[PDB]
C-alpha cells in the first residue's frame, strides 16, 4: 500500500502535540516518554493526547489518527487488529472491529477504510479549548497489544496525527511511537534505562 508521510509539519497554525506527565508508577495506565518520543499504554485504556496551535484554525478543521509500522520493511503493511481481537465483537458501534485506534467519548468520531490503500484512520472535529484551558485533548484507545500475534506481532508502530481542513487537506502533522503493554510504567522505565546506555 501507499506510504503516508510521517514528516513533522507544524504548518501555518503552529500545530504540535502534547502529553501529560503521568510518571512511571506500576499502576499508571498511560505514560509518555519525551526522550523516546514514545507513548506506553494499556489495552483499551484512555490515552490523552493534547493538541496545541499558535493560532486557531478554521471551524471545520479536523484531526486524524493513523498507525504505521516504524520499521522500513513493515511500513507498507496496514496496521490492523490481530485475528483474535478483530473477532471479539467489541465495537462501540462506530469503530470497525479491525481498527487498532479508537477515539473515546466523541460521538462525532468517524472511521475510514481508505479505498485505495486499505489503511485505517479515525477523525474527529476539533474545537478551541474550554474556558480556562490552553489546549484541547483527544482521548484515544489502542485495541491490541504490541505483542498480539497476527497483528502488530511485536513490531513497533507510530501514530501519525494530522490536522486537516474540512476537505482533508493537510494543515499540520506530528507523530509518536506507541507501545501497548500490560505495565506501561515499568516498560517506560526499562526503555529509558536502556537508552541511558
Ligand atoms: C467548532 O470549532 C471551532 C469553532 C471556532 S469559533 C468558536 O471561533 O466559531 C473556531 C475554531 C473551531 N475549530 C478549530 C479549532 C481549534 C483550536 C484552537 C486552539 C487553541 N486556540 C488558542 C487561542 C489563543 N491563542 C493566543 C493561541 C491559540 C489552542 C489549542 C488548541 C486549539 N484548537 C484545536 C486544534 F489544536 F486541534 F486545532
Ligand atoms: Zn490483538
Numbering used by the authors: 95 to 291
Q: Could you give the paper's own sentences about this structure?
A:
The p53 tumor suppressor protein is a transcription factor that, upon cellular stress, is stabilized and activates a transcriptional program, inhibiting cell division and initiating DNA repair. Although other genetic alterations exist, the majority of TP53 mutations result from a single-base alteration (missense mutation), with most residing within the DNA binding domain (DBD) of p53, which binds selectively to the p53 response element. The TP53 Y220C mutation (TP53 c.659A>G, p.Tyr220Cys, p.Y220C) is present in approximately 1% of all solid tumors. This single amino acid substitution creates a small pocket in the p53 protein, making it thermodynamically unstable at physiologic temperatures and unable to interact with and bind to DNA effectively.
